[PDB]
Every structure is written in structure tokens, then in C-alpha cells.
Symmetry: D3
Subunit: 160 residues, 6 copies
């Protein structure tokens, strides 16, 4: 079963948008969001990836309790939120903690309630509403198969 390490940048509940300077590994404040929204899940990026936009591949991790920024979490993917913004493709792999039997009932995109999925989508559809020149479109939930393929691809680009 595929699994990888996600470095969580942003705990669920946060309106501060944290980033990593990937050359140093330092945590940075990108910005305080302009909309009254909060990250709907712990959010970060998969280590050792280069995604379809030449940046590390982003990840959403479902957790019973948020972690802190900078924290590593072994995760396995269950689907992906495909999406395009002002800078191109900017997909978000949906994950759950790997090796944790409490999440064994969550295997594919159909195992996550439509309420959570809609909430996550709503966040990404709207979080940049009040930033001029930023938008998101082509918002679309896809399944684990497509998540794994995109992870695989992005692991190769990182090595190549």
C-alpha cells in the first residue's frame, strides 16, 4: 500500500497560512488569510516530490487532533482534490495516517462523507476570494488511483 511522509505546514483551524522555504526547511508565514476562513484539515506537502506545477505536491491529512507546523506524519492517500489556480495546477492529495487501524475504514474517496468533502472544496474555492489576481477553478474530487498516480509521477520528477 502506498504511503509517504507529509510535512504538515498548517493545522486545521488556522487562518495563518504557513509555508516552507524548501531550500532551508524553515517554516515561514505566507500570509494571514484575507477571508474569514480556516484550513479545514491539517495541510502540508509530501516530502521529496515535484508536482505538476514544479512545486512540492500538497496534501490534506485527516486527523483526530491537529499537529503543529513542521511536523511529519506518515500518511497514505485516499483521493485527491484536483484544482487549478492563478499559477496552474495545484492539486491536493487527501490522506489519512498510515498504519493506524482507526482509519482502515477509509480506503477511497467514497469513504469520506460528502459533508467533509464539500467543506474542503468550499475552502479552496473561496479562501482567495479577496485576493485580486488569485482564483481557483476546475475544482474536482478524484479517487485514490488518480492520487497514487500523481504522487508516483511527482516522486519521479523529484529524482529526475
Amino acid at each position: 500500500a502506498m504511503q509517504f511522509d507529509v510535512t504538515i505546514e498548517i493545522p486545521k483551524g488556522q487562518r495563518n497560512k504557513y509555508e516552507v522555504d524548501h531550500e532551508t526547511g524553515r517554516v515561514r508565514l505566507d500570509r494571514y488569510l484575507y477571508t474569514p476562513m480556516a484550513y479545514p484539515t491539517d495541510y502540508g506537502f509530501i516530502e521529496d516530490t515535484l508536482g505538476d506545477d514544479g512545486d512540492p505536491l500538497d496534501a490534506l491529512v485527516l486527523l483526530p487532533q491537529p499537529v503543529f507546523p513542521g511536523v511529519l506524519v506518515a500518511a497514505r492517500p485516499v483521493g485527491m482534490f484536483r484544482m487549478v489556480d492563478e499559477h496552474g495546477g495545484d492539486d491536493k492529495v487527501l490522506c489519512v495516517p498510515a498504519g493506524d487501524p482507526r482509519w482502515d475504514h477509509v480506503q477511497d474517496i467514497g469513504d469520506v462523507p460528502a459533508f467533509e468533502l464539500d467543506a474542503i472544496k468550499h475552502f479552496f474555492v473561496h479562501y482567495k476570494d479577496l485576493e485580486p489576481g488569485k482564483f481557483v477553478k476546475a475544482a474536482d474530487w478524484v479517487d485514490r488511483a488518480e492520487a497514487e498516480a500523481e504522487v508516483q509521477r511527482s516522486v519521479e520528477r523529484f529524482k529526475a
Copy 2:
């Protein structure tokens, strides 16, 4: 200068939507929001009011630090967020703490930055997005004069 007591129901930052049962004064959980949004300001209602929809008149209070639900805050109005939802008129009086010289620079709607005002509006425009049969429209910022008039009116209805 007009001033009144706001009972804060919801601290800034909250996705739990709290209410008061007005016959008992008890704090109640209305619902956890369906959108990944958080109240942009401390939010409650003005004591001893009956607003244009037969419910107590709602208030937003700007604070350097949030309070807890149930807490009273002496406030003075500086503008109002006019708005209509599925149940009619549902305006929100914008306030600052009364008698606090740190807020003396905030007198009318023009004294609050467009960033905060847009954020507040965005919240109310979108918080009910994923609740079917609920919407908001006629979103409009108005000045202190109109806030005071609507407060006055609603104080009378409460007595009448």
C-alpha cells in the same frame, strides 16, 4: 453618545455557532458551521431589542481579544451590515467597546478598514453556502446614523 449592552454569543475564531434561548438566557449550540469559516468578530445581540424580524438585534463587536459566550460588553455602534436571509431582515450592528479611549478613533463606518469590512461581509455572504434553503442577499454596509436609528426602533418594539 448611544451605547448599549451586547451579549456576546460567539467569540471571533469560532466555527461553533452559539445562540441564546431568550426566554431562559441559556447559551445553546445552534450548529457547527457547514462551511470552513470562522466568525470574523465577536458576535451577539443587543439586550432588550426586538429587530425588524421579530428577533433580537444582532451585533458585531470589534475587540483586541475575544471574550467567552454569555459575556456582556458595553458597546457603541459605528455602522451596520444590512442583510437579508431566508427568514427576512437580519442586520448586524457594528460596534466597538464603549468608554474605551483606544477605540475613540473609530466613530463611523469610514473609520474601519475596507479589509475588515470585506472580510466580515464575505463571512455572512458565504457561511450558509452549504446549508440548503439558506442564503443571504442585499448585503450592504451602512453608517452609524442608520445603525443608531435601527437600534432606537428596536428598543421601542421591545417595550411596545
Copy 3:
């Protein structure tokens, strides 16, 4: 479908054990727990009940986010944690928010994962470990039918 109001005394995560003086409705600190444990769910009591031990019937409410002490939550039962302590029967009705379609998949005790149920049980089996003269035994999960019956019974005693 049965539903009732729970007054939450203790948010999930708390080692402070809060109580209500039922004659006044005031929130009181019973004690800081002696064990390094935290309430596994929001915890309180059902309003207008007299349980099998002459005290109000206790409730556990599953929530996506904790509330504050004193808060009312409309809830419906899905099972019960039967249990006896030094002062007799001291059952805990397991609930979810009433009228919230996000919890519609949770109808009976079999709909709650064994992990959560074991965790809840573990808490009540051990929280009083270091208090001399206090114990719990006859720990047993039962279904909604038995929860409703015990609620019904306790509503009658409150009126009688």
C-alpha cells in the same frame, strides 16, 4: 425520534471536572482529576431528569468540536454506557446532535467505532483510580433501545 437537551458540563479534553449545582444552575469545579486523563467526549446531563441514583441522568455527546461548560445541546441518544460506582448506578447516555444530518449515519451503538467506545469505557474505568473509596464496575455498553427506556423512566421520576 427521541431527543432532549443536554447541558454540557465538561468539554472533551478536560481534566477539570465541572458540575452543576442543580438548585441554582451554577457551574462548579468538582475537582481536578487525580489521574492524567481527559474527558473523551463532551459530558453533561439531560435537563429535567432524575436517574436511577436520584441524580440527573448523565450524557456523553459526540461533537466535531467541543462546546463550553453550561452550554445546551439538543441531542438524540444512540446507546448507553451502563456503569456502577461507589454511589450506585451512574449510567451515561451516548448522544449525537439532534437534527444534524452529519450524524444521521449514527443511529445505534453499532454505528460508533469500537475504538471510541473502548476509549470512553477506559476513561470511566480508570479516571477514579487514585481516589480512595471510589471505583467503577459493571461497565457495559448497551443499545439505543435501552438508552431511550432509561431516559423515559428518568423523565417520569423528575415529574413524579
Copy 4:
């Protein structure tokens, strides 16, 4: 052994100064402090007292973990912080939770480390530094005997 109920208005750590309207029992925001200071202990007032300034007698309660505003705590006194401000005498009874054997080693003012006592004093000496027309003087730690006497006195005035 003397004991009484303290209604905690302010958790340790807070820069929001909460009050009670004693005619209604409602919690109110008095003000956000003007100095960058935080209450050094849970702070409130003893129920059913009228202190030497015609206001309820104030209490500091040592706790392993703070409570929320409005919460009642059975407490016993161990000393008092005598003090005078712009409105006269404004003493603060130092307490620990009554009936809790974890605090049995704390019986009189000499049982509380000089570090905590100095910190508490420092708070009250300085919290009003930037409020014009407010000051505190005659800051003085006294023992349990004097605390009990002042409590007793203030219980009588409340009845008389």
C-alpha cells in the same frame, strides 16, 4: 476550618478583565488591560460578602489548572493581599481549593513560595500603571488569621 465559595471571574493568564454585575449575576467585560500583564492566578470574589469598600470581597485561588469565568470553587483562605486603590480598600484573599488533599501542605501565608507572592503583588502594583487616575498602594501580604477575620466581617455586613 473556614471555607466558602469563590465565583471565579478571571482565569489565570488573562488580560481581559471580567466582572460580575452582582444584581443580575451576569459576567461582563470590564476592560482589556492597558498594561501587557496577565492575571497571575484565577481571580474572583467570595459569594455573599460585602467588603471594606462596600463591594464583594475579592479572592485569588491557586489552581493546578484554570477554570472558566462564572465558575464556582469551594475554597479556603491561606492569607490575604492587603491593598488600597483609587476607590479605597481592595483586599484580595488568597485561597486554595477546599477539601483537596493536594493543597493540605498550604495552610498559611508562609506555605506559599516568595516567588508566587512577589509575582502576585507585582501584578497588582502595576496592572493599572497606564490608567490615569488609578493607582495602588499599601501593598502588603498578611496571614490566614487576618484573612479569616476580614472574611467573617464581610459576611456579617452582607447580612446586615
Copy 5:
């Protein structure tokens, strides 16, 4: 007087169990605990040690306020919680902040109240209760002399 640096992995109050990948120094989520328990003290490991189980020697640090994961704290030992789990010896050195006169009254294991010591023990006796194949036994508090000896030993193994 012996002193050393502890890297705190887990603040007091946490049910998320954090770890360090010792080759990278990165903070990692080991798991969310399966029991409704919370770390009773700030918890981590002593830098530059190899303990009796070939892993870094673990430390509990008493603090007036928790730190964040990853934080270094100069500490001095006052006793040790000896203990064996499924993977062998897994002792926990009890410490207080070095060079802080507020902790000068705490010199040896007898200076820490039996309540805290019992609570700490209870945590480690039970935290793994619901993890199959994990247990702890030979739980035993020992004094500073034995703590220092075990630290010394583990400093040597790290160099050897």
C-alpha cells in the same frame, strides 16, 4: 551539579504522541493515543544519550507552563521512573529546569509530592492499555543518584 539539555517532544496535556527522527532531528507524529489520557508532564529525551535500550534516554520535565515540541530545556534530574515495556527498559528521568531558583526546593525524589508521582506512574502504567502487544511493567520510582548514574552511563554509550 549534573545538568543537560532535554529536547521536549510532548507538552503536558497532549494526547498526540510526538517523536523525533534522531537522524534528521525532525519532529514526527508517532500516534494519537488510544486511551483518553494526556501526558502528565512535558516529555522528551536528553540530547547525546544512548539509553539501556539503544534509544535516547527519555525525560520528564516539571514546568510552570508547557513548551512546544522541538524546544530545548536545560534541566537537572531529581529522580527517575524506571519501567519496562514490550521493547525492554524504557526509563524516564524526572527533571526540573536547571538554574532556576524557583525549583531549588526540588532536589531529590522525596521533594516531589506523591500525588504528582502517582499521576505520572498511572499515565505510563495505562497509556498503552488499548494497544495490543504493548504493556508496561516493573514501574518503580528511584532517586536522583540512580538517575544521574543512568544518565552518565548513557552519555558514555553515545560517545562509545
Copy 6:
């Protein structure tokens, strides 16, 4: 316009005083403050500086919401709190987030309310009150021009 990276060591609200070991970049607990005070702003140091006391130049960053320790924030200076302590000059550059139009109204020291400036000063005047052999004097607010000059100077010393 001048801008630089501040590594925030201490979030606003904290009584734990965090430090960086500048040779390793590790976050360390310096001490829990002895006074009941809390940092009035996010506090840290400007990367790649050597200030007038041979230590990195310290920075205060105004934020709508605090960050975590270790976090980098692109900032631009708007003034400086000049100050001398037991170890010499120990100035604090006042900053706001660089590239954030919400702070464009804050350009020089006159753009920050006297209330915030007095609060910040009060903190540094008093935070060491109960530490023997530590003091601060020559407390003085100066403008952006002088802040930039001192930053420039300290960037050179770091290279030289």
C-alpha cells in the same frame, strides 16, 4: 523599501521566554518570566544581523494573529524601541509584515497608537523587575529612519 526576515521566538501572549541557540538554530526555553507579564507582540530577531551588543538584532512584529516559535516572517521596520539593560544596548526594531497591504497605513512610528507603544514600553520596563541584577533604562521610541540605520549597521557587522 527595506525589508528582512524576522525569526519569531515568542508569540504575543507568552510568559515563556524562548531563545534561539544561534549556532544550531534550535529553539530553547530561556526562562518562564518572574513577573506576571506577557510579550505584547510577536518577538524575535532579524536573521543575519549582529547588533550593537554583539548579539542578533531583536524585532517586534505587529500581527493580526500570532505565529509559533521558529517561524520566519518577512517584515519591514517602522520604528525602534531603544533601550539598555544589564548587558548593554538591546534595541527592539518595530516591524509589520512586508508586502501586506493591510499594514500600508503603518509607515513610521507616528502611525502606531500611543496605547500600543506605551504597552510595549511598559513590558520592557518591567518584565525583569523581579530578577536581581537585571534592569532596563534609557527606554526610548525612535523613528523608522533610525531603525533602518541600525539594521543596516548590524547587517554589515554580521558580514564583517
